[PDB]
Ligand binder design. Structure first.
Ligand SMILES: O=C(O)c1ccc(/N=C/c2c(-c3c(Cl)cccc3C(F)(F)F)noc2-c2cc[nH]c2)cc1
Ligand SMILES: CC(C)=CCC[C@@H](C)[C@H]1CC[C@H]2[C@@H]3CC=C4C[C@@H](O)CC[C@]4(C)[C@H]3CC[C@]12C
Length: 241
């Protein structure tokens, strides 16, 4: 039996250990929705308190993605420069993809601080167009009904992309990429799920949305710096200043 069957198992294990929120929990909690009063309470919070809360949650989400990457076979054998290039370009893209598990398309709500709420929860941030675009992206992804292994293999490939500008050992990233592509396509064939391939997001769209999102987080961080629970100095240094 294949190195490729083992790679599937190892990527899904890494995802299971780092997925942050369990899918059964997220699905069971869908009926737990913020009340009108609770939504108004969030809308009345300071922009800067909502930013502190959201920035903290997003930092934590990024760190789970870093831990996911560190567990992908061969990722720790890449040189540090390339590790950082890959994580800088792709970790927030993965966070945006992971969001769809916590998104309920029936009422367009996301799981946030223990209950589901719509995008109006975030009104104090004054980012309605960007936040609407983030909700719209999860709405599009939710139509695929991604399984846990599909999310694991797809987000591994979001990260392990040999086309990212600035890699120093491109051939070594290509080797991991090809094996992950084969793992993903083998798994979709085995589960009769190859039809999702044509429905995956155009790559330019995830990159565009992520670039706009990170640009806004950078603006907030310039205006109102946050305390970061920093665990990854080389990555922190690339993003914070
Ligand atoms: O533990 C560590 O060391 C560490 C290091 C870095 C981290 N995240 C950096 C962020 C942020 C971001 C966030 Cl999440 C919140 C507030 C402000 C920002 C800002 F934009 F300012 F950077 N946004 O995208 C990334 C990113 C993109 C690719 N890779 C990381 C998180 C933990
Ligand atoms: C534009 C701006 C200033 C903020 C974005 C507002 C909002 C869209 C952000 C704030 C917190 C985020 C969640 C945080 C954690 C997770 C868990 C992860 O496993 C999956 C992703 C998820 C649920 C994040 C989704 C995006 C949220 C709600």
């Amino acid at each position: 039996l294949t190195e490729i069957e083992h790679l599937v198992q190892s990527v899904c294990k890494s995802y299971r250990e780092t997925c942050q929120l369990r899918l059964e929990d997220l699905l069971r909690q869908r009926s737990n929705i913020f009340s009108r009063e609770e939504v108004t309470g969030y809308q009345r919070k300071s922009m800067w308190e909502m930013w502190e809360r959201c920035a903290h949650h997003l930092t934590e989400a990024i760190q789970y993605v870093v831990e996911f990457a560190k567990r992908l076979s061969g990722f720790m054998e890449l040189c540090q420069n390339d590790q950082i290039v890959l994580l800088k370009a792709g970790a927030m893209e993965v966070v945006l993809v992971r969001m769809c598990r916590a998104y309920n398309a029936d009422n367009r709500t996301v799981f946030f601080e223990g209950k589901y709420g719509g995008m109006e929860l975030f009104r104090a941030l004054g980012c309605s167009e960007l936040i609407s675009s983030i909700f719209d992206f999860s709405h599009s992804l939710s139509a695929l009904h991604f399984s846990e292994d599909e999310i694991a293999l797809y987000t591994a490939l979001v990260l392990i992309n040999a086309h990212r500008p600035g890699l120093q050992e491109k051939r070594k990233v290509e080797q991991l990429q090809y094996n992950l592509e084969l793992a993903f396509h083998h798994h979709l064939h085995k589960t009769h799920r190859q039809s999702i391939l044509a429905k995956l997001p155009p790559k330019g769209k995830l990159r565009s949305l992520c670039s706009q999102h990170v640009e806004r987080l950078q603006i907030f961080q310039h205006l109102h710096p946050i305390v970061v629970q920093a665990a990854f100095p080389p990555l922190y240094k690339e993003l914070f200043s």
